[PDB]
Amino acid sequence: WGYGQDDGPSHWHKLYPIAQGDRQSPINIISSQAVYSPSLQPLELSYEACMSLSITNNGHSVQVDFNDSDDRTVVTGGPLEGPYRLKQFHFHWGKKHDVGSEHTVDGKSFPSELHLVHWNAKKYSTFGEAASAPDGLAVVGVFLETGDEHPSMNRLTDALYMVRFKGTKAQFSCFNPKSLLPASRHYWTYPGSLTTPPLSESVTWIVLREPISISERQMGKFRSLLFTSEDDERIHMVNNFRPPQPLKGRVVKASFRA
Numbered sequence: 001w002g003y004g005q006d007d008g009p010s011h012w013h014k015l016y017p018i019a020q021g022d023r024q025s026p027i028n029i030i031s032s033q034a035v036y037s038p039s040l041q042p043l044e045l046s047y048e049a050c051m052s053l054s055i056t057n058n059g060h061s062v063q064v065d066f067n068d069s070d071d072r073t074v075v076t077g078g079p080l081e082g083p084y085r086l087k088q089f090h091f092h093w094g095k096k097h098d099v100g101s102e103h104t105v106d107g108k109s110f111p112s113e114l115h116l117v118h119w120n121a122k123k124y125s126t127f128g129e130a131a132s133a134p135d136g137l138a139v140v141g142v143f144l145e146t147g148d149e150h151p152s153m154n155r156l157t158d159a160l161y162m163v164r165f166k167g168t169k170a171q172f173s174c175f176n177p178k179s180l181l182p183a184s185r186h187y188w189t190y191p192g193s194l195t196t197p198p199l200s201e202s203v204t205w206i207v208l209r210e211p212i213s214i215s216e217r218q219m220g221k222f223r224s225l226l227f228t229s230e231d232d233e234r235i236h237m238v239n240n241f242r243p244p245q246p247l248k249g250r251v252v253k254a255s256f257r258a
């Protein structure tokens with residue numbers, strides 16, 4: 001599978017029938033319809049500075065992996081009943097500045113969306129195991145818009161060169177993902193799924209209300225990455241996102257009032 005004209009999202013269901021399930025992600029968030037839920041606890045992202053291991057071009061996105069042997073880098077509170085350890089983060093972006101995010105807000109996309117993937121290691125033995133349970137995963141999504149240069153993003157920006165080709169990876173020590181968070185912890189949350197195959201409906205989504213900003217140059221580096229391996233005909237990794245899926249009666253909650 002992929003994001004090409006033949007193996008793109010509109011055809012994934014042929015391999016993964018859950019692609020057409022009742023809690024697929026992403027979705028279009030209709031702000032006026034989200035339910036303000038003050039009963040939710042505060043969302044807390046307690047991330048340590050040196051838990052990162054590597055950066056990898058897996059052919060679908062560029063992903064930074066973390067050491068999840070313990071819970072020093074977890075997301076807690078909000079709709080979650082316990083701590084979920086950070087496993088990795090990656091991005092989705094477009095060819096043009098007007099698209100790229102997976103979730104949309106009132107029909108609007110951002111040039112990119114960041115995904116912080118966590119799993120319930122407290123009750124499940126492996127990430128793979130948790131990825132199949134309704135309460136197994138928690139992904140925090142952060143929208144990215146272009147504007148002023150993001151200081152910390154340079155660390156990642158300057159590393160993209162080494163992984164321009166599919167299947168390449170490199171050591172990536174001491175990157176604190178907290179540096180990629182906005183100053184607000186307001187969010188929308190709803191029960192969903194992974195946005196790429198196997199598309200398992202095991203994700204409690206937490207989409208931050210406030211986006212972070214990166215310069216057009218930093219955004220451009222992401223577009224310099226390739227879907228293709230070192231030998232293949234260069235095909236730039238762009239538009240690696242899945243369109244909004246049917247809500248199907250799901251309730252979207254908000255930690256704030258619009």
Ligand SMILES: NS(=O)(=O)c1ccc(NC(=O)CN2CCN(C(c3ccccc3)c3ccccc3)CC2)cc1
Pocket residue numbers: 115117127128129131132139193194195196197198200
């Ligand atoms: N954009 S998103 O929604 O934030 C997203 C986040 C992570 C992913 N993918 C992974 O982190 C890679 N996982 C996928 C699940 N894999 C499981 C699995 C496969 C099929 C059904 C359920 C779980 C797996 C388990 C054991 C062996 C191999 C794979 C492990 C590797 C895809 C999308």
Ligand SMILES: [Zn+2]
Pocket residue numbers: 090091092115195
């Ligand atoms: Zn993702």
